[PDB]
Amino acid sequence: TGTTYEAETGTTLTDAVVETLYPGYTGSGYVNFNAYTNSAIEWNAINNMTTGTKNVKFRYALESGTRNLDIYVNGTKVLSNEPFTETGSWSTWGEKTIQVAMNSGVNTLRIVTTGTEGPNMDNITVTAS
């Protein structure tokens, strides 16, 4: 089952805001990226039992188009312009899973816009791959 970390709480936001306009989110809301570039969500407390490759499953909404995010783990960029494809509606919450290396113990993960803005981001769920 893993751990789910909400996007809206327990994070640091840059040019991004907590929003509740579209229904279906988990927790208290979701995050809306505001800037086409350099908007960010940083999770500061991703807590793993083991070091290894993780499945990081983003729950997100994206009415149309593809939007690409840079993905950092423990301060190092590890995915460049990773695509988030459309869900069809701002209240259609889809899932996208990436496979990235993380350490045991406490880690950080930061996702950043790069020129196409971002999906509305609900949470991430991290499991061992």
Ligand SMILES: O=C(O)[C@H]1O[C@@H](O)[C@H](O)[C@@H](O)[C@@H]1O
């Ligand atoms: O070590 C791991 O990968 C897993 O550790 C578990 O305890 C966490 O609940 C899960 O989120 C991590 O993916």
Ligand SMILES: O=C(O)[C@H]1O[C@H](O)[C@H](O)[C@@H](O)[C@@H]1O
């Ligand atoms: O296209 C976007 O990024 C934005 O479009 C609308 O403003 C929508 O209400 C937002 O939730 C979304 O973030």
Ligand SMILES: [Ca+2]
């Ligand atoms: Ca937005």
Ligand SMILES: [Ca+2]
């Ligand atoms: Ca949420």
